[PDB]
Amino acid sequence: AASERRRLYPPSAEYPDLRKHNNCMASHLTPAVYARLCDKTTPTGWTLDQCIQTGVDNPGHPFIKTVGMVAGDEETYEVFADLFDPVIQERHNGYDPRTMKHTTDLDASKIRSGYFDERYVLSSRVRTGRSIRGLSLPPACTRAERREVERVVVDALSGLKGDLAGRYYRLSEMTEAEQQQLIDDHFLFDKPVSPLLTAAGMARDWPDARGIWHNNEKSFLIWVNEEDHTRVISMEKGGNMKRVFERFCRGLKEVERLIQERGWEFMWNERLGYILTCPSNLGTGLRAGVHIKLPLLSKDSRFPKILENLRLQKRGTGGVDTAATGGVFDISNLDRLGKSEVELVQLVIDGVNYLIDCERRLERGQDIRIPTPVIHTKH
Amino acid sequence: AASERRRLYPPSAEYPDLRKHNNCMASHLTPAVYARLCDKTTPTGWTLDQCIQTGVDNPGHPFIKTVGMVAGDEETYEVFADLFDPVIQERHNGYDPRTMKHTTDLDASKIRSGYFDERYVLSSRVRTGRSIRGLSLPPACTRAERREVERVVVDALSGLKGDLAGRYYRLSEMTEAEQQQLIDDHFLFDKPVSPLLTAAGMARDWPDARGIWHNNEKSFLIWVNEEDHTRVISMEKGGNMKRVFERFCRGLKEVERLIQERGWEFMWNERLGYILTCPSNLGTGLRAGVHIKLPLLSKDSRFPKILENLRLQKRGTGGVDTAATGGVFDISNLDRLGKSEVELVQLVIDGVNYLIDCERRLERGQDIRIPTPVIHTKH
Amino acid sequence: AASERRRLYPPSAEYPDLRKHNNCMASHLTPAVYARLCDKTTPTGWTLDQCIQTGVDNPGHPFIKTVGMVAGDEETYEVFADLFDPVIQERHNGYDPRTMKHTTDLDASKIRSGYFDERYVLSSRVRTGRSIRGLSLPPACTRAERREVERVVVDALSGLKGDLAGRYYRLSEMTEAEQQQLIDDHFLFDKPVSPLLTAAGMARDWPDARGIWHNNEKSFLIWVNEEDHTRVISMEKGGNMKRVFERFCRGLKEVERLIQERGWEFMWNERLGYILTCPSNLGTGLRAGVHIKLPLLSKDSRFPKILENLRLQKRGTGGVDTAATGGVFDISNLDRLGKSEVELVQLVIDGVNYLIDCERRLERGQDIRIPTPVIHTKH
Amino acid sequence: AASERRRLYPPSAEYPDLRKHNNCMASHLTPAVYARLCDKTTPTGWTLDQCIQTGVDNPGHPFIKTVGMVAGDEETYEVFADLFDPVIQERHNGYDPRTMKHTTDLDASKIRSGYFDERYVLSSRVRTGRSIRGLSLPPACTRAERREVERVVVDALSGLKGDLAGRYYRLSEMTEAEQQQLIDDHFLFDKPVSPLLTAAGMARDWPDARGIWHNNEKSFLIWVNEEDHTRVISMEKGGNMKRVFERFCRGLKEVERLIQERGWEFMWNERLGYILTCPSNLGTGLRAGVHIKLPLLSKDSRFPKILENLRLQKRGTGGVDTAATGGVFDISNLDRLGKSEVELVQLVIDGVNYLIDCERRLERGQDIRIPTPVIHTKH
Amino acid sequence: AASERRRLYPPSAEYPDLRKHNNCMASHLTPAVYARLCDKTTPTGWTLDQCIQTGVDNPGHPFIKTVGMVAGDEETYEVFADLFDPVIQERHNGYDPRTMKHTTDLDASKIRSGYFDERYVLSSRVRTGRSIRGLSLPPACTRAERREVERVVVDALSGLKGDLAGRYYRLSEMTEAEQQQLIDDHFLFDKPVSPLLTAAGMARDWPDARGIWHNNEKSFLIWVNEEDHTRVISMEKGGNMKRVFERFCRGLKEVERLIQERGWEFMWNERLGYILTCPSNLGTGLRAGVHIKLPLLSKDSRFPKILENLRLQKRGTGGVDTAATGGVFDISNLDRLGKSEVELVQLVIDGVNYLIDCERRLERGQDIRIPTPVIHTKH
Hints:
Chains A, B, C, D, E: It catalyses: creatine + ATP = N-phosphocreatine + ADP + H(+). The structure is cut from a larger assembly and holds 5 copies of chain A. Chain A is of the alpha+beta class. Chain A folds into 2 domains: 1-98, Transferase Creatine Kinase, Chain A, domain 1 (Orthogonal Bundle); 101-379, Glutamine synthetase/guanido kinase, catalytic domain (Creatine Kinase, Chain A, domain 2). Helix content of chain A is 32%, strand content 14%. Chain A has 12 helices and 10 strands. An 8-stranded antiparallel sheet of chain A has the order 2-3-4-5-1-8-10-9. In chain A, β6 (268-269) and β7 (273-274) form a beta hairpin. The relative contact order of chain A is 0.14. The interface between C and D is medium-sized, with 25 and 25 residues.
């Protein structure tokens, strides 16, 4: 079967209108790249148009630049490398996946210090994501694939013991009692509403095969099939970041051991580290942060320059209204790819300690100095 | 695909009888090249036989050597390079597309002089052609493809402003009034009659999707889907070649800007310059010329040689009822590939000024010298 | 897969030149039939051209008409039925394989009479052939297939007992002593020399896998892989045709029993009877005959006719160019398909008894009568 | 009904029994080579078994070793190189087609001397063969392909002029008068009888598409579709080898010119020279020889060695009868590949002159000496 | 890369040696059937050889005749119908799957009577099997397919409520305590040892994905992935066959409802009823029986004939000990296909009651008659 003589609409006839757009995808797509890749496909059928759909549907904001594209599976990053690499490089400022390598380091014993002054730090948490090799990512997976991811993770989790032992809840058969309890613990998540996510097809078949798992002492949380196969979280009230990270590393090694026992692996490669659906979460996909009170320093205009030089970012206390509380922020690492998880946590520990010291000095009517930029350059 | 003990006609069985032919194609086709390429095809199905058909159908005469082959699409020049390169090299005397590069230069500000003596130069004009990447050329395009060229080009032209603003006319819905007006302005073109063109399939579906566009002041003309996707022309009565060329360059840059806004590009590459359907128009595809009154000089036997050394060619005024009026010729550049458009216009300006000088000498009874050979590629 | 754009040689371009030919194949091949079948193939790859090659290579004589085509395997008769049926019908005068059926009858007990006057009949013999289902015939079999026929038959022959017990000899490892003995018994056969056979590829790989088998009392002979998988022969000096035929039938049933025990069958179907490589040997593939002395009758001018009405044929026996070395002839049945083996042997018995009677008459000076043609007996 | 789960007879099951064979093919075929190539095929379907069939069918003679295999088409030599190369190397003693190159030289002007003493040399002749690229060789060509060869060659020969002008005769429509004339001139050839040729399928469809062509003065002979597409021969009574060779070279260049005009070429490549059906005729496929009288030299015991050292071979004049013929031999070059045709003719000229010299000496009882061997190699 | 020029071993070369065999498969396989089906395959790749392997490996007992073949998937019964139909017909004495239909009836309310005299009947049970459509049967399923059957069934069972609520046990993670408990209840099963089963590949990957499920009151048992996807059993001490059958029908309808809710179905068709791996269990795959004490009637010579006429069969008790008790048998229905489950249970109820009356008559020295044959004819 073949029409062969009939004409396909040429590539340019399908080119998206990105004239009013502001996202990484739009900054790197060109007619040449589009024509070169519009015919390619991954083994499971994911296409270039499907990668960029969310970026076409969401022009963005002029003050905030989004990525604008998602991966459908592991092969996506290779097949469509001509578009993904430039985007990855811009997003992780400088990291070139074509000539550089990412190194993973989950040895919590290398952390020094790690115990924050608890009259400033309310809570500490470390988050990451993992993908199960051989199954499509949230944007492209079929119902059977999504159900396979859930069966695999749940069997592994049920093998955890000691302080990692826990319970799993399926959103589809969760009772009102359980549902309420999870909301109180701040462990529940719901159907994505962000159009950046729904346009990428990440809310299909909801709530089929999504679930929540946490250990009995409520310090280790795992989300199944939300915006990635799994989102792994270690949290605690207080400022013992070191202990939070040790539990984080221990749980991850234990979970990986258990799935390898049944023949599965995490998606990972040496140039991109752990593979996740959004290019912004490549490498370590790690967010180590604290909820900290900085009432005085938050008024000083050198604050932004301080955060920037320490490679830290701030955001509303999650439970943000028009204006979240007053002086309470969510501070976490900026970088994600090109630095190990040990290096990133250490960087957050050093940065937060410096921030606390600034706030204590402003308290004694003293003066502070802008810290010297965290190098981040070998040659 | 399976069963096949039946034999195909060998390549030589299809070889054309070129014993009485006189064109570039015939001078370079050999049994070896034919056998090597008769099986190849471009992505849209164009074949070697289709490239050379016009050359087989039109033998020629020994007094004029024709090219003898056309391109069906952009890929043609690469897939069938073993035949096209030798032809291109002979036609553009020396230019070797395998080791040389063509440079484009549309900076009218580099033009020196440019104002001819108006008692010799009646009119000035500069012409070229452009192809829209992704769509087949006139010899091979389907109706949908041809209709595509027209809507893309027409969308662009309607965005021109100022002295470049104009009007478009479709030959298929042109009224008798409009038709008459266009004939008076010398802007109309009709169904090709040259067998070199009809044998190449360039008159199919006439007049579907062909049209004419000109600015309001009638100094910028564009022909759609005639012997190329577009033929762009800048003209004026008089001898202000410089102004004619500035408008030419300005309009081309504006038109290119406008089609890139909608995702389209011109066919171009560094070894062949702009891609057009006939190999003789590669590079700049430029014809810069004047209508000049050379009554005295035209009777001198040296005239042919002077032209040759200045790399200029002459032809009839456009009036084949008598001898035009007598002494009026169309003088334009000979070269097309391997020299920028700025270099070619400058060369015409210098050559015409020298031609004018010769005329003025014969007037006062002075003698003239045959200029010395112009800029070569080292021959 | 060179190019669906390149042309195949049309059927007529491959049509054989049969203008000077005289064989059944040439009398029935037409452009229409050739075009219709030249693309067809049997499961093992046998083609129309391979079927008729021998008929193209051997034009034949205007007096004696040969068949002109062979079968490569059992399926050949069905796939190429449009050519084979007409040929079969002409050759077996009238038998139409499309509407008629052949009946096999190996019940020797039905034979009446069968003991010839030994002063006229020197020897009696009955011959036939058998093909092993699932293996290609001599014209098409590979070496492995031919070897398989040998392994299969030889295993069955070694299971014969009593007066059917015998010995097998491979032509390839036969000693000079054995060879000389077989020549004296008239049991040896050599490489085919007839161009009707070599052009049909029946002498390939000689003498690989060909052999001879005979019972101890030398009255049952079997040839392996000569001009058929097997040629089975029952012979005796004298005129006890009845005994010769009982041994023939007994041996065949025993051999068939033995190969079926190992899972093999003879090629046979109800419209064509036993399948053999030459269409002339279809049905029973049987030749029942005697060596008889007809001094006086031989020289009568009606001889050719009495034979004809009795449906008998005569041939030489003598030596180099078998003609008729003095009143001694080889008389045997003419028909082969459409009559059972019992009907054919009975017909030879009745015919020879009658022929003898003509001789006895001529000897006594009495006159002879041309018998009336034999019209269909019954079943 | 072909299952990919059913087993193919393994390669060794098809291996030929070559235990009693004596030919180049048998000396180089091994189970490993057979298994490696038995699955390969040329674009037109020629197989390994078809290449070697003649070698399997003809064991050979303990005295003279034959090649034992033929090529079906040009690609055969490449696809089955693992068997052909070793054979080619043994046959052309040393020439390794994997590391060496053959050079063609048809410049007759380089010939020094070339006029033999006509008291010893009765006649001189030079022979070779040529294949038309794109058409199968005699062992494999279909009727349509064989007919193509004839049409292409006959059209070209009809374009020859002057002393090369001639006439063509088709064996199939040759009159008895014409046949007899050709026999008297010794220009006719008939159906091959050599089993080395018939087993290789070279007598199929005889005499369809075979023919004879000669120039008017009867000094240039061409055989069409006999044991190669064409066999080209230059001959003359007497000993003017130089003139015979000039005509040979002139006619070949003229014929090649003429077929290239219609798009065809000769089969040729740099490692094997001209490609012909029998590996023994590769390179130049040239036989330059004379019919010479050597009564004394022939009875001397040093003859076989004199011939050997001069790289010449002898054979009968072609007259058997009852007691053959004395003193007249056919002497020609031994080598064929790895030396140009100019080098080979020169070698024959030098060798024959030396042979005449040993005779004139023996004719006077004098002594002669073994010449130093031509077997010197520079590169 | 399977060269279609090469020959496959003919079908007869692979034919099994069944001369000493005694099973249904051997009684119906013929060379014709084998050749016709040896090339066919099911969509998942199951072949004829795989169907019959167990029958070839196990010749059987001259006394007891086994089926000798298994199905690999649902399509098997259709693709290989030419062998299966004859076998099915012999095994279910008369039932012709080509012209007859099977009717299913699980309406327990139609049962009349059903309460056996508990001084004779120790226990009552009804068993059957079910296959999940879309997944291969035990002989052919991969590990993933087998695990899928476990996944599906288990979810369905966990949805059962009331007196059907239960617990599931995986053989692979069963504790010694649980094992022992299951052995005491007579609910455990182990790795198959019967060579009829292991030769059919039904013990592969043991104990991966096999499990046991039973309701809390221990009256409903389900075996997962043993000799079928599921074996469903209803049992009770005593003789309330009616209640046992009502629970049987209720549980089956509930289980079917639950798997259809998730998109799955049971393998079923109108000519064969429920599809299971052994042809002997087609139709209803039902075994309704009792453990009955019949000491007096187990001595009468007529007993066997009585069983036969009532279409009942007997077998040993269990935990066999040549001490404990005699007179205790396992009596159940003989028929399986061609009668509804309601008709079969009713038939067992009537037959067993007749066997109780008979015993009692014999406890009063009275005489008993041989019941008239419970025959239902159609043909």
